Amino acid sequence: SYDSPDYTDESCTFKISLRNFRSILSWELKNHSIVPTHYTLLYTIMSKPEDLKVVKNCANTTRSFCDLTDEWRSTHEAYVTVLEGFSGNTTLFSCSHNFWLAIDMSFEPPEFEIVGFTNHINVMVKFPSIVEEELQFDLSLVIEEQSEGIVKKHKPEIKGNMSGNFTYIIDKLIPNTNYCVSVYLEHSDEQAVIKSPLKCTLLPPGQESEFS
C-alpha cells in the first residue's frame, strides 16, 4: 500500500502500433463499477488543441481499436488523442493525450526470418510491398544481433530496403554462434528501441572433435 489507491476505473492508457505502415491505435480503460461498451475516438494536432476531429467508423463504436493509415499522415506535427467514452447514454471519460510518430512508431507486426550459415547471418525482414518513394517519412531501421551473448546494433541505410524483403548479411562470425535478431527503428534518439520478438537462430556448430 503506497501513494494513492489504484484508480482501476479510468486508465485511459492509449497505444499506437504500426501494422504494415498502417497506424492503428488501441485504448485501455479498466472498469470498476460502471462498464461502458461504446467509445468514440478523436484526434487533432498541436497547432490547435480545440480542432478536435472525430474518426469515421471509430465513432460510437463497440470496437477497441481504430485504424487511420491515411488519417495520420504527419511527421513534424504532434497527433493529439482524445477518447470520449460514454456508458450507455452518459459521458464517462474524455482523456486527452498525445503521440509522437517521430519518437515512438512501434513497428512489430512485420514478419522476419534469419538464415544461419556457418560464417554469416542472412537476415530477411519481410516488410510490406510499399513504394518508399511515395512515403514522406524519415527514419532508420536497426537490425539487432545478439550472437553468443554479444549484443550488436546494426543500423544500415533503409533507402530502398523497406519496400519489401530487407536483406542484411552479417559476417565476421565463428562457428556455433546462437544469435537473436530484433527489428526496431530509430530517428533522432535511442528511446525508440521497439525490440520486437527476438528470433534466435543457431548456425552450423563447430564444436566437433578436435584433431590435427
Binding site: 497547432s47 490547435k48 488543441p49 480545440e50 486527452s96 518513394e133
Partner: protein, 165 residues
C-alpha cells in the same frame, strides 16, 4: 563564419528559452485555435547552405523586437527574456558574422528579400492577432507554439540532412 558543421548550441538554446518562458500550456487552452503557419516555403526550400543566413538574421530581428516589446516583457519572465535578448543577439552576431566575411551569403538575387518579406508579414500578422486578443495568456502560447515551430522549420532545416532522395 560557421563553415564546418562541428557543433552549435545557438538555435538549440533559443528554442529551449522559448519553452522555458512558457507560463501555461496551449494544450489546456481550447479556445485560441487561430494558428498561423511559419512560411517554410521561403526558408526550408532553396536555402540550405548559408543562403538562409540573411533570412535568419532578419527573422531573429523580428523575434527580438517582438519579444522586447513592453507587452512581451510583461507577459513572459523578464529574467528569462533578459537571457533571451542576449541569446538572440548571440545568434544575430553569429549569423551576421558570415555577412561581414566573404562567405556566400549575399549573392542571390532579389529573392533574398522575398524570404525576409515572408517572415516580416508573418510576424506582423501575429502582432495583429495579439492586439485583437489583447495579448491574452493563451494567445501568447499560440505565438510561442508558432515561433517554436518556426525555429524547427528554419535553422533546424540546416541540420535536416537525413534523406537525400
Amino acid at each position: 563564419c560557421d563553415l564546418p558543421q562541428t557543433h552549435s548550441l545557438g538555435s538549440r538554446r533559443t528554442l529551449m528559452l522559448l519553452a522555458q518562458m512558457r507560463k501555461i500550456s496551449l494544450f489546456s487552452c481550447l479556445k485560441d485555435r487561430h494558428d498561423f503557419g511559419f512560411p517554410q516555403e521561403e526558408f526550408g526550400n532553396q536555402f540550405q547552405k548559408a543562403e538562409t543566413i540573411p533570412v535568419l538574421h532578419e527573422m531573429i530581428q523580428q523575434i527580438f523586437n517582438l519579444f522586447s516589446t513592453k507587452d512581451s516583457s510583461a507577459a513572459w519572465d523578464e529574467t528569462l527574456l533578459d537571457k533571451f535578448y542576449t541569446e538572440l543577439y548571440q545568434q544575430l552576431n553569429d549569423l551576421e558574422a558570415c555577412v561581414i566575411q566573404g562567405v556566400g551569403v549575399t549573392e542571390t538575387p532579389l529573392m533574398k528579400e522575398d524570404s525576409i518579406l515572408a517572415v516580416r508579414k508573418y510576424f506582423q500578422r501575429i502582432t495583429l492577432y495579439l492586439k485583437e486578443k489583447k495579448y491574452s495568456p493563451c494567445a501568447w502560447e499560440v505565438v510561442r507554439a508558432e515561433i517554436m515551430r518556426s525555429f524547427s522549420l528554419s535553422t533546424n532545416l540546416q541540420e535536416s540532412l537525413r534523406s537525400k532522395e
